[PDB]
Symmetry: none
Subunit: 37 residues, 12 copies
């Protein structure tokens, strides 16, 4: 939950790849299967 920015200037390339992944496939902070008695 925060800003993403890819600001480009003078670029001359043949292949480029900019990949920002904050959570791709994470049970991040997931309480899975808790039980309390």
């Amino acid at each position: 939950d925060a800003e993403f920015r890819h600001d480009s200037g003078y670029e001359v390339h043949h292949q480029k790849l900019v990949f920002f992944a904050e959570d791709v496939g994470s049970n991040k902070g997931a309480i899975i299967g808790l039980m309390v008695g």
Copy 2:
């Protein structure tokens, strides 16, 4: 929940790929299966 920006200037390329993924397939903060008694 935040801004995304891809501002482009002078670019000369053959292939390019800009992928921003904040949550792709995450049970992020999901309480799954809680039980309390």
Copy 3:
């Protein structure tokens, strides 16, 4: 829940791909199956 922007200048390319995915398939903040007594 925030702005998305893809502003383009002078671009010369053969293939390009701009993919912004904030939530694609996330039970994000989903309380699934809670029980309290």
Copy 4:
């Protein structure tokens, strides 16, 4: 729930793909199956 913009300038390409997905298939903030007594 926020603005989307794809403003284009001088572009010369063969294939391009701009995909913004804020929620595609997310039970996002969905309380599913809560029970309280």
Copy 5:
């Protein structure tokens, strides 16, 4: 619930695809099956 815009300038391409999906198949904020007593 926000503005969408695809403003185009000088574009020369063979295939293009602009897809904005804010909610496609999300029980987003849906309280499903709540019970309180």
Copy 6:
């Protein structure tokens, strides 16, 4: 949950790859299978 930025100046390259992955496939802080009695 923090800012990402890739601001570019004068770049001349043949291949480039910028990959920021904060959580890719982590049960990060996930309580999985807790039981208390």
Copy 7:
């Protein structure tokens, strides 16, 4: 697309919750945004 059954015998409980969800919020087998030329 198949049968569901919850047949009950002698049950004595204080809280119970039987939730069968085959597809809740899934773009399941959905071709979204295909393009062919």
Copy 8:
């Protein structure tokens, strides 16, 4: 797409929770954003 069954015999409990979820929030087999030329 298959049968679900919860057949109950003599049960004496204080809390119980039977949750079958075959697909809850999955882009399962979803071709999202394909492009071919």
Copy 9:
């Protein structure tokens, strides 16, 4: 896509929790963002 069964005999318990999740939040077999030229 297969059968689920929870057949119960003589059970005496205070808390119980039976959770079968075949796909909960998985882009399972989802081609996301393919491009071919």
Copy 10:
């Protein structure tokens, strides 16, 4: 995509928890972000 079964006989317990999770939050076999030219 296969059968699940929890068949119960004579059980006397205070807490029990049976959790079968085949895919919970996996981009399992997901081609994410492929590009070919």
Copy 11:
């Protein structure tokens, strides 16, 4: 993608926990970010 079974006989216990997790949070076989030219 295979059978799961928890068949129970004569059991006398105070706490028990049977957790089968085939994929919980795995980008298992996920090609993430491929590029070919």
Copy 12:
């Protein structure tokens, strides 16, 4: 992707815990960030 079985006979215990985890949080066979030119 193979069978799981926990078949129980005459058991008398105070605590027991049977946990089978084939992949819990593994980028198992995931090509992450490949680039070819």
